[PDB]
Amino acid sequence: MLIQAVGVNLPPSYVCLEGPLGGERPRAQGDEMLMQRLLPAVREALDEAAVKPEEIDLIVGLALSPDHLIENRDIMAPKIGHPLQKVLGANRAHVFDLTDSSLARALYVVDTLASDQGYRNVLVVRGESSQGLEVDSESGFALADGALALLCRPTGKAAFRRGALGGDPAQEWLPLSIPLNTDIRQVGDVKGHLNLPAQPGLPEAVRAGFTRLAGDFPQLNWVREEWFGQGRPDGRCLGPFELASQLRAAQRDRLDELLLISFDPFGMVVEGVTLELAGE
Amino acid sequence: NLYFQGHMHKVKLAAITCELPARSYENDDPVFAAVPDLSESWWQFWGVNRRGYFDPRNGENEFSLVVRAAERLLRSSDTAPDSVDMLICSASSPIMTDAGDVLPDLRGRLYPRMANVLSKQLGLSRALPLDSQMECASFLLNLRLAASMIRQGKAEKVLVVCSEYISNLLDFTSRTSTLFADGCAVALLTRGDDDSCDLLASAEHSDATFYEVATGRWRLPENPTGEAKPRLYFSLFSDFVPTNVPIAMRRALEKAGLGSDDIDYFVFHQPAPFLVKAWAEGIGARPEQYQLTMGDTGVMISVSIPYTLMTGLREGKIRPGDRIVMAGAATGWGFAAQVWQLGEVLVC
């Protein structure tokens, strides 16, 4: 899988939460919705790669937010990939969604499908506008809000690893869940609650998992997701959106191959995908 | 004196099974008491006479029946759990309700989805869990994903699951709730050990022009009674020719190098008789080359296709060595078609 261009658009509003799994993360405010940031992120990648929206063959989306997706903040399905196709004008494109998948796992699956079907311009998007999800105030965990656009060119040659978290190998990590809000009174109320039990050793175990998985590709530099503020400067972390700056840094340094590693809070594993990069 | 060509592995559709809710609901069932605008022409137009609804009171949910169906299929196909390389699940309802023994205390949830939980429940210790969504065409997507994985040698056994618990999103104060129903489907795809079976070609495309027509939305009932609580409801508000499904079939046939006359049978999504009839005629399929199955099951979203495929096999309408076409549309909107060379498919 080749990364032609990367686009990112994050809200300027940062909200800090305390706890072992807390941190300072961007958060959508008021009536803001995901498409406000997703579209400019996509157009940024398309412009960078000199690709017109008509040329897009495939669109795959990742977004947990149950509302605040599009102009009608109340719509939850079909997923945001279809509204995006409409505003973009990607009339040749196929659209689907990989739900709670990690970005690394999605890039791997998409590289397989897109190469096998002969696609040349593929768009993988990750975004959140989580006003509709209550954060885990006990542990401090919360999703970062924003949008990430990866314009890719498939090759079918991407490698994949699904590795365990570091730390105590016998520790049963409690996974993330998003229970439904049982007492919804107004359409604007939160639709679900983030539940990730307070586990002070998790942020380092995730980092340890990243380093372990990267050991399978020692010749590759790698990029990562940071979901937690612990050990991070100012307590700030952008979750999956940390990848944008790291990817662009790899571009400035003219790297042609990379390892991208994600953290899956639902499966409590780390997943890596090998990638190619486009030069200048 | 020449080099050798690489060959994609052939994809075998090894086994398939479905699990429908035990209880059926007639059109005159009291469930539709609060529904207005129920004409006899409405029922005849959509071709639905009965439908299935999961009964959670007796342990019927999107997860329990999948375990049952999956365990049934795994045992019937003599497939070891640790031999499954990938598990691809789909569930159009954003609301899930059961996680078996994996997350026993977790009830109604938006996330996680099913793949990872089910793999742990079933013991698929080597399976990569994936959860895709293409609504009514998710079964075709999962076959497409599984096939490409098998073709490129990244998996040798892929377990596909579609579980539609759509009744929990039906607004029974609106007549929109009269068409859709619940159901489960499980299928096993493997690397072909011969030329018996293969996915010859497929075509997927999407058009979002009419996206807002069919949506899942957080709203109040259309005709509420008393203190109305907001809920996630299937919403159909909007104000046309079915050509994209034929387009998908033409593209798939051309990629496979075949024509409509080379196809022995057809399996369509089951939205309404007049749409299946339109799709069939748009590609040149004759009435005896496909079935209408919504009559006793309703529109089971992504399960209509695998259920129709199963009945075709079970009833002898689809035989080994037959070349079939599977096609359908889906909210979004999306369209998928697949040209299959079928061998012996285990029905269980």
Side-chain angles (χ1 to χ4, degrees), chain A residues 1-279, chain B residues 2-56 58-74 76-226 228 230-236 240-318 320-348:
Chain A
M1 187 78 137
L2 179 89
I3 306 298
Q4 291 183 70
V6 48
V8 63
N9 193 290
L10 308 176
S13 45
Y14 282 82
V15 174
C16 149
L17 297 175
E18 289 179 357
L21 312 181
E24 177 168 344
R25 310 176 178 101
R27 189 83 71 81
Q29 296 294 304
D31 202 49
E32 296 168 3
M33 45 86 176
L34 177 51
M35 188 63 74
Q36 297 170 340
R37 309 212 171 273
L38 178 58
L39 183 58
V42 171
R43 296 194 182 287
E44 186 181 21
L46 294 178
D47 174 89
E48 179 185 333
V51 176
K52 296 176 172 182
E54 295 78 10
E55 304 172 13
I56 299 172
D57 304 307
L58 179 63
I59 294 174
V60 182
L62 292 171
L64 303 174
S65 291
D67 54 46
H68 289 89
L69 297 169
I70 51 180
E71 184 66 37
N72 187 331
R73 277 65 170 178
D74 301 335
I75 295 177
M76 184 181 182
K79 308 281 184 178
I80 191 161
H82 303 274
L84 181 60
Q85 181 187 31
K86 190 173 186 173
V87 296
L88 280 176
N91 45 279
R92 292 176 60 185
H94 175 218
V95 178
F96 67 86
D97 194 89
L98 292 180
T99 69
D100 67 354
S101 172
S102 70
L103 188 58
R105 193 196 319 165
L107 291 170
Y108 175 55
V109 171
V110 170
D111 180 62
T112 301
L113 178 67
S115 69
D116 189 45
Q117 287 292 65
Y119 300 156
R120 292 178 60 88
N121 290 314
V122 176
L123 192 62
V124 181
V125 295
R126 174 70 177 264
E128 294 296 347
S129 198
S130 60
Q131 295 102 308
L133 298 173
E134 185 183 354
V135 302
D136 189 330
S137 57
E138 295 296 329
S139 70
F141 180 73
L143 310 178
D145 286 335
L148 178 69
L150 296 177
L151 182 66
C152 307
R153 180 169 302 277
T155 71
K157 286 150 55 178
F160 177 78
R161 295 292 192 278
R162 181 176 168 96
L165 306 186
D168 194 307
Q171 184 166 358
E172 302 294 354
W173 299 104
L174 304 177
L176 169 66
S177 66
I178 303 185
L180 180 68
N181 180 7
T182 59
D183 188 13
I184 298 173
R185 301 293 294 270
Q186 306 281 312
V187 298
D189 298 330
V190 297
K191 312 305 183 299
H193 316 276
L194 298 181
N195 184 275
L196 181 41
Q199 297 164 92
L202 173 62
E204 178 54 34
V206 176
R207 153 123 301 167
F210 290 158
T211 302
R212 184 183 300 171
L213 192 152
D216 291 357
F217 307 94
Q219 299 179 64
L220 295 179
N221 305 303
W222 49 289
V223 302
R224 67 190 194 276
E225 310 175 343
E226 227 86 36
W227 292 65
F228 307 99
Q230 176 185 120
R232 303 295 300 164
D234 307 297
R236 280 197 178 191
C237 59
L238 310 178
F241 310 117
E242 295 280 14
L243 301 164
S245 63
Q246 307 176 60
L247 287 165
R248 293 189 178 161
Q251 283 180 341
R252 284 129 56 184
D253 292 357
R254 289 173 177 172
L255 305 180
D256 58 3
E257 55 188 353
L258 192 69
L259 167 64
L260 184 153
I261 314 180
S262 299
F263 168 58
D264 180 12
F266 297 105
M268 282 296 160
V269 301
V270 291
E271 288 172 315
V273 63
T274 61
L275 301 170
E276 304 179 31
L277 276 182
Chain B
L2 294 185
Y3 62 86
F4 293 77
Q5 282 290 326
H7 294 343
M8 296 295 119
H9 296 274
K10 298 197 178 304
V11 183
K12 178 172 183 182
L13 207 174
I16 188 169
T17 185
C18 293
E19 197 69 28
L20 300 182
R23 182 130 135 240
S24 293
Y25 292 77
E26 294 288 348
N27 295 345
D28 61 1
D29 192 84
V31 74
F32 306 109
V35 180
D37 308 321
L38 290 182
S39 53
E40 301 174 5
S41 60
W42 171 270
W43 296 114
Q44 288 290 322
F45 174 81
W46 297 102
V48 183
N49 310 321
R50 288 157 206 75
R51 61 191 58 69
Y53 295 145
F54 291 159
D55 184 6
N58 293 122
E60 276 189 351
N61 57 71
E62 79 290 353
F63 189 82
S64 57
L65 297 180
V66 167
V67 175
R68 181 191 296 177
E71 290 182 343
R72 180 170 71 254
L73 182 145
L74 291 171
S76 300
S77 61
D78 195 62
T79 300
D82 55 358
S83 69
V84 179
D85 301 318
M86 188 174 188
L87 170 58
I88 307 177
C89 296
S90 289
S92 296
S93 173
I95 297 170
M96 291 184 160
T97 68
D98 189 9
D101 308 312
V102 182
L103 310 176
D105 307 326
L106 183 54
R107 302 294 185 271
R109 70 179 196 273
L110 305 177
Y111 300 97
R113 308 307 295 171
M114 177 172 307
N116 189 40
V117 172
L118 180 60
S119 66
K120 294 178 176 292
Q121 185 75 27
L122 301 176
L124 315 182
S125 54
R126 297 262 292 178
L128 178 63
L130 186 66
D131 293 287
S132 69
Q133 182 146 343
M134 198 176 171
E135 275 86 15
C136 311
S138 292
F139 183 75
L140 300 184
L141 176 64
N142 294 1
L143 297 194
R144 174 69 281 182
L145 294 173
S148 297
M149 220 73 178
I150 297 169
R151 286 163 52 80
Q152 296 187 345
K154 301 168 184 178
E156 296 184 29
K157 296 186 180 181
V158 183
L159 193 62
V160 172
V161 174
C162 290
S163 184
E164 302 289 22
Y165 190 178
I166 195 70
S167 62
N168 65 9
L169 262 66
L170 296 180
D171 182 14
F172 286 99
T173 78
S174 177
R175 59 183 181 182
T176 61
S177 60
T178 63
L179 313 182
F180 308 98
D182 302 330
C184 300
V186 183
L188 171 57
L189 277 65
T190 69
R191 176 185 288 175
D193 52 8
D194 55 76
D195 302 319
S196 172
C197 183
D198 187 25
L199 172 56
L200 304 181
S202 68
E204 303 82 36
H205 76 274
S206 299
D207 183 289
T209 300
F210 311 113
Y211 162 79
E212 287 192 344
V213 175
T215 63
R217 197 177 302 182
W218 300 93
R219 60 174 180 82
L220 294 160
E222 181 173 352
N223 312 285
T225 300
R231 276 184 47 200
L232 181 67
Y233 283 132
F234 170 92
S235 311
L236 183 149
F240 293 77
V241 299
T243 52
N244 287 286
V245 171
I247 289 170
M249 289 184 291
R250 295 187 191 92
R251 293 176 175 174
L253 289 166
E254 182 157 13
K255 279 193 73 175
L258 304 184
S260 60
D261 66 354
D262 299 312
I263 304 304
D264 299 305
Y265 209 74
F266 295 80
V267 179
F268 293 107
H269 182 47
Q270 302 290 309
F274 93 98
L275 290 176
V276 182
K277 293 173 190 169
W279 296 339
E281 297 178 332
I283 199 69
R286 290 146 16 217
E288 69 277 5
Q289 298 187 280
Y290 59 94
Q291 278 173 124
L292 300 180
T293 60
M294 76 288 289
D296 291 334
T297 65
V299 188
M300 301 182 294
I301 315 302
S302 67
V303 174
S304 286
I305 286 177
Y307 181 79
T308 303
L309 170 61
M310 188 191 68
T311 60
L313 294 164
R314 182 178 295 170
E315 294 183 8
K317 298 286 178 283
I318 303 172
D322 277 355
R323 290 181 188 93
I324 70 163
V325 172
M326 302 199 290
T331 58
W333 293 72
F335 318 92
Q338 299 184 353
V339 184
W340 276 91
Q341 168 73 79
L342 292 183
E344 281 185 23
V345 182
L346 169 55
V347 180
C348 55

